[PDB]
Structure formats: structure tokens, C-alpha cells
Amino acid sequence: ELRVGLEESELWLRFKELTNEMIVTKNGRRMFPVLKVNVSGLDPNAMYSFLLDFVAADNHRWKYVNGEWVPGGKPEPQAPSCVYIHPDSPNFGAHWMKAPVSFSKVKLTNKLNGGGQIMLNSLHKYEPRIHIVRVGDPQRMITSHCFPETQFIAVTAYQNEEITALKIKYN
Numbered sequence: 182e183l184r185v186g187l188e189e190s191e192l193w194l195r196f197k198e199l200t201n202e203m204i205v206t207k208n209g210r211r212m213f214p215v216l217k218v219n220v221s222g223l224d225p226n227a228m229y230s231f232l233l234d235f236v237a238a239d240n241h242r243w244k245y246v247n248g249e250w251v252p253g254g255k256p257e258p259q260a261p262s263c264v265y266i267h268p269d270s271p272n273f274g275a276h277w278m279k280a281p282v283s284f285s286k287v288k289l290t291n292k293l294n295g296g297g298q299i300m301l302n303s304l305h306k307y308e309p310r311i312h313i314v315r316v317g318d319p320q321r322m323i324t325s326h327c328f329p330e331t332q333f334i335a336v337t338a339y340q341n342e343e344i345t346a347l348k349i350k351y352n
């Protein structure tokens with residue numbers, strides 16, 4: 182059975198309980214926490230690529246008012262569907278299953294200015310999604326794995342002081 186498990190789920194849930202925020206910048210910013218997953222049930226002999234994209238969690242934008250996140254507007258036109266290819270791709274099933282798969286180098290941006298970055302809209306909520314694909318597969322089989330523990334709001338600057346403090350404590 183294919184099984185994809187979120188690593189450091191307790192750490193993600195500490196951020197999610199505050200409402201998680203990730204900074205987006207012109208030139209792009211790495212995530213904290215880093216999305217990491219454990220994988221079993223691939224064919225160890227087959228080759229696969231790991232892809233990451235970000236799905237809009239909501240049909241509205243958000244704002245931080247009186248220490249709380251609340252609806253802040255109609256949603257802006259959706260960011261383009263940017264896909265990050267895990268840099269170990271393509272690789273054997275055995276490679277992906279021997280140790281957790283870490284998306285440490287993905288960068289979130291608010292400007293289409295190159296570098297294989299992911300464009301997000303500030304003050305919109307996103308859910309990370311991992312895709313597995315098999316090299317050679319005539320079926321072009323894709324799996325999709327959603328991690329609701331890792332939902333966050335994209336911001337140009339941290340709104341919640343408790344998030345600023347969590348990011349410093351655990352990073």
C-alpha cells in the first residue's frame with residue numbers, strides 16, 4: 182500500500198493552532214517548518230519524481246484584526262498553478278523510502294521573477310500538496326497527497342506576534 186506520512190506533525194500543529202503564516206518576497210523565501218514526508222509502498226525498483234504545489238484553501242482573503250484572523254475581502258484571481266520538482270527527481274523508489282523526503286529549498290514569492298519559485302497571493306490561505314509520478318509510465322499516473330496540518334496564510338510580513346516568536350523558538 183502507498184503510504185505518505187507527514188514528518189514533524191506535532192511541530193506543524195503548534196503553528197496551525199496559531200494560524201500559520203509564511204513570508205512571500207520578490208526574490209522568494211524558504212518555508213519554516215519545512216515540508217517533510219515519509220514514504221512506503223513505492224516499487225523500490227521503479228523511478229519516480231516528487232512534485233509540490235499549493236492549493237487555495239478558501240474562497241476569500243484573510244486579514245488579522247484584534248489578534249484574530251477574519252475574512253478580509255473577495256478572493257483575488259488565483260495565483261498561477263506553479264509546480265516545484267523535488268531536486269532529487271527522478272530517483273528510485275528505494276531512494277525516496279530510505280529517509281524522509283524534505284522540500285527544504287522551495288521558495289515562496291509574490292513576484293514572477295524566475296528561479297523555479299512558487300507564486301502565492303498575500304493574505305490567502307494555501308494547503309501544500311505532494312504529487313508522485315513514475316518515470317516511463319504510459320498511464321502518466323499521478324498521486325496527490327494533501328496535508329491540512331501544513332495550511333498557512335501567505336503574508337509580506339508576520340501579522341501574529343506569537344507566530345514571529347514560534348518561528349524564532351523552533352528555527
Ligand SMILES: O=C(O)c1ccccc1OC(F)(F)F
Nearest residue numbers: 183222223313314315322324
Ligand atoms: O508504481 C506506480 O505504479 C506508481 C505510479 C505513480 C505514482 C505512484 C506509484 O507508486 C505507487 F503508488 F505505489 F503505486
